[PDB]
Amino acid sequence: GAMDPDLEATLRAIVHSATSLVDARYGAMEVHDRQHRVLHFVYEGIDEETVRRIGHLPKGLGVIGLLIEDPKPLRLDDVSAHPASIGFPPYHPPMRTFLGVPVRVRDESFGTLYLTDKTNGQPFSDDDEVLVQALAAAAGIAVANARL
């Protein structure tokens, strides 16, 4: 089933402002069930054809899974060089710089929010980290309340 229309709109707005304000080329969010299972995937910066070529949606594997495992922000200058990296699938754009955080309310986890390839060519900043943390907290609030 599709997401609640208000939750969908809110989550897309959050991904867009995170992406834009942090100057990321790509931004995405995963919404989770219980036992951290991906239910929905919201993203921007990739065109429609490319999405068709990739074909399959992420399972929230690899580096993304560290955001759940270790509920702290993770910044990397070369994402796929990380030993937990599962790598990109065929047709997926290559990505280097990465900023990701768990989407949470208190101790409950609701998903993950992540940005890649800052237009700078530079790594993501502490200010970037702090802003994305705040947007993830807002996302957590939205998910927790759309749900119950």
Binding-site residue numbers for heme are 92
In angstroms, rounded to a whole number, what is the distance separating the alpha carbons of residues 141 and 48?
30
Question: Residues 6, 37, 72, 87: which binds ligand HEM (CB under 6 A)?
Answer: 87
40 vs 79 by CB, closer to a second copy: 40
CA dihedral 74, 79, 84, 89 (to 10 degrees): 130
Burial of 43 (0-12, 13-18, 19+ CB in 10 A): middle
Site residues (CB under 8 A) for a second copy? 5-7, 9-10, 13-14, 16-17, 20-21, 105-106, 127, 130-131, 133-135, 137-142, 144-146, 148
DSSP reduced 3-state for 55: coil
Asked if 139 touches ligand HEM (CB under 6 A), the answer is no
Question: Residues 8, 26, 125, 129: which binds ligand HEM (CB under 6 A)?
Answer: 26
In angstroms, rounded to a whole number, what is the distance separating the alpha carbons of residues 76 and 53?
26
| Token pair in block for residue 33 | 């069930």
Under the rule (CB under 6 A), what is the footprint of ligand HEM? 26-28, 43-46, 51, 54, 56-64, 79-80, 85-89, 92, 95, 98, 114, 116
